[PDB]
Design a protein around this ligand. Structure first.
Ligand SMILES: *[C@@H]1O[C@H](CO)[C@@H](O)[C@H](O)[C@H]1NC(C)=O
Ligand code: NA
Lengths: 36, 251, 26
């Protein structure tokens, strides 16, 4: 069954797997932090 | 993509190019969800009002690409399609409800630094991330302006928009299988998908497990990057039981 | 904060067509 998909899905070889951030992913993360 | 920037090498390794062989032209974007399955918009393959009706042998996919046009030796991989599956309740007559299709590759593609599948959301991921104001990322080789093709893959980050604002923005009937994204006029920033970006992914990075999830498919808009208009995206999570049914029965 | 899309599943059980809108982007 497909289920959750690839055990390794969504982890990029040149970014997450090397502990390196891309140039704008921080903008995404900041938008996921709520206001007051 | 309007008002985006060049993608970084390896930034979107699930990005797929759907290429029409004759004439030789970009058809649409798509995304890699496993070694033999590609996800796209149904209207990229089937849109009778514009005499569009492609079959498996009309197209080829190109995976691992960055340049729009250059052959990328030892980087890109070409694949042929074994079978296309269009959602049986895709509404081409009206509003593109259920604008989703799966494509099975004849041979599985080898993963690499440049080729790697994106995740599909579970229920908690979808609940935690599909909130107004939260940003996703859209990528593609589509036009740079509404009225102009990029040399390499483009990327733009856009916030999800509240459903009443989406509905007010358009004359079209908006269903629960769609969401909209883009900046409002008052927000200053700009950006949108455009022609040629259809079928590509809207992804979000989970702050819980560090993985990228495909929450949307580029579906339709009105113009590109117009004030007071928003792009519409297929709601992948809401259609995920169909995706799984196809992969389980036919994978 | 407000939900951008419903957390549920499409199940079994009109309006203006997209192609009539000037400048529609498909
Ligand atoms: C698409 O093409 C197939 C095969 O040519 C045809 O049988 C089918 O009726 C077409 N679909 C639509 C919706 O026109
Ligand atoms: Na807009």
């Amino acid at each position: 069954t497909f289920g959750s998909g690839e055990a390794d899905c969504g982890l990029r070889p040149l970014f997450e797997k090397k502990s390196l951030e891309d140039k704008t992913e921080r903008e995404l993360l900041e938008s996921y932090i709520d206001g007051r | 993509i309007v008002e985006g920037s060049d993608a970084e090498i390896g930034m979107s390794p699930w990005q797929v190019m759907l290429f029409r062989k004759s004439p030789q032209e970009l058809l649409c974007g798509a995304s890699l969800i496993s070694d033999r399955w590609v996800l796209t918009a149904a209207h990229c393959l089937l849109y009778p009002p514009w005499d569009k009706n492609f079959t498996e042998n009309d197209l080829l996919v190109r995976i691992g690409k960055h340049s729009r046009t250059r052959y990328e030796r030892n980087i890109e991989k070409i694949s042929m399609l074994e079978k296309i599956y269009i959602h049986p309740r895709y509404n081409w007559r009206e509003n593109l409800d259920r604008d989703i299709a799966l494509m099975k590759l004849k041979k599985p593609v080898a993963f690499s630094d440049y080729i790697h599948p994106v995740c599909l959301p579970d229920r908690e991921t979808a609940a935690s991330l599909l909130q107004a104001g939260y940003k996703g990322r859209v990528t593609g080789w589509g036009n740079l302006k509404e009225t102009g093709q990029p040399s390499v893959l483009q990327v733009v980050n856009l916030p999800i928009v509240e459903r009443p604002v989406c509905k007010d923005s358009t004359r079209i009937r908006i269903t629960d299988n769609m969401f909209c994204a883009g900046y409002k006029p008052d927000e200053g920033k700009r950006g949108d998908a455009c022609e040629g970006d259809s079928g590509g992914p809207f992804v979000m990075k989970s702050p819980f497990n560090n993985r990228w999830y495909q929450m949307g498919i580029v579906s339709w808009g009105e113009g590109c990057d117009r004030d007071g208009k928003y792009g519409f995206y297929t709601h992948v999570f809401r259609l995920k039981k169909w995706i799984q049914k196809v992969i389980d029965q036919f994978g | 904060g407000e939900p951008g899309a419903p957390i549920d599943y499409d199940e079994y059980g009109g309006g203006t067509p997209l192609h009539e809108i000037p400048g529609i982007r498909l």
